[PDB]
């Protein structure tokens, strides 16, 4: 599928050189950062979307995530399907596991409180996570069948909102440097 959304946000720390390339492709080179999130995808997310990607380069030096990323409202939820990472594998309140797309993922929730979100500088919300149990191979075509995550989350009582914001295949980092190159469809 064609992508129609470009995500490029930083808290102002370090230097993030995020380039919105042709088609579904983008690249990121970053250094000495705070927190930042970059990615390509869709303006309106869906719990039925299959996200395809090929990360030709996935070279975090320190803490970075290669992850599906998006939000809902009603209620406000930030969510992740983390396929790979750098030195830090994200975890939180442990819920259970789900199998999808040849991997096994642990399911977590975490709470942000007086934190920045799509709703403002100081807001409260839950984050929903699927985090692969081992770093996914990169450089070949990969699929995230998002519905399998949505359904597993629902079984553990984690309900997404009915108002869908953007939905992207993202590079996130925190206090790190690195590079990535990812094509999304």
From Swiss-Prot:
Provide an example Pfam family for this protein.
Glyco_hydro_11
According to its UniProt record, which residues of this chain constitute the active site?
78, 172
Chloroplast as a keyword of this entry, yes or no, is no
GO BP of this protein: xylan catabolic process
Protein's pathway: Glycan degradation; xylan degradation
Q: Which Gene3D superfamilies match?
A: 2.60.120.180
Q: Which reaction does it catalyse?
A: Endohydrolysis of (1->4)-beta-D-xylosidic linkages in xylans
An example of a GO molecular function for this protein is: endo-1,4-beta-xylanase activity
Query: Into which EC class is this enzyme placed?
Result: hydrolase
Q: Which PROSITE patterns match?
A: GH11_1, GH11_2, GH11_3
> What keywords are annotated for this sequence in UniProt?
Carbohydrate metabolism, Glycosidase, Hydrolase, Polysaccharide degradation, Signal, Xylan degradation
What Enzyme Commission number(s) apply to this enzyme?
A: 3.2.1.8
> Any idea where the GH11 domain is?
1-185
What InterPro entries does the annotation carry?
A: ConA-like_dom_sf (IPR013320), GH11/12 (IPR013319), GH11_AS_1 (IPR018208), GH11_AS_2 (IPR033119), GH11_dom (IPR033123), Glyco_hydro_11 (IPR001137)
Family, as annotated: Belongs to the glycosyl hydrolase 11 (cellulase G) family.
The molecule here is called Endo-1,4-beta-xylanase A
Q: Which organism is it from?
A: Bacillus subtilis (strain 168)
């Amino acid at each position: 599928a064609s992508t129609d959304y470009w995500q490029n946000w930083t808290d102002g720390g370090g230097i993030v050189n995020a380039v919105n390339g042709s088609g579904g492709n983008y690249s990121v080179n970053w250094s000495n950062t705070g927190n930042f999130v970059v990615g390509k995808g869709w303006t309106t997310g869906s719990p039925f979307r299959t996200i395809n990607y090929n990360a030709g380069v996935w070279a975090p030096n320190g803490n970075g995530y290669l992850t599906l990323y998006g939000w809902t409202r009603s209620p406000l939820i930030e969510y992740y399907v983390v396929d790979s990472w750098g030195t830090y594998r994200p975890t939180g309140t442990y819920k259970g596991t789900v199998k999808s797309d040849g991997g096994t993922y642990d399911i977590y929730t975490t709470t942000r409180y007086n934190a920045p979100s799509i709703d403002g500088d100081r807001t409260t919300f839950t984050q929903y996570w699927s985090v692969r149990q081992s770093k996914r191979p990169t450089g070949s075509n990969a699929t995230i069948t998002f519905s399998n995550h949505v359904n597993a989350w629902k079984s553990h009582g984690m309900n997404l909102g009915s108002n869908w914001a953007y939905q992207v295949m993202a590079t996130e980092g925190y206090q790190s440097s690195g590079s990535s190159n990812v094509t999304v469809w």
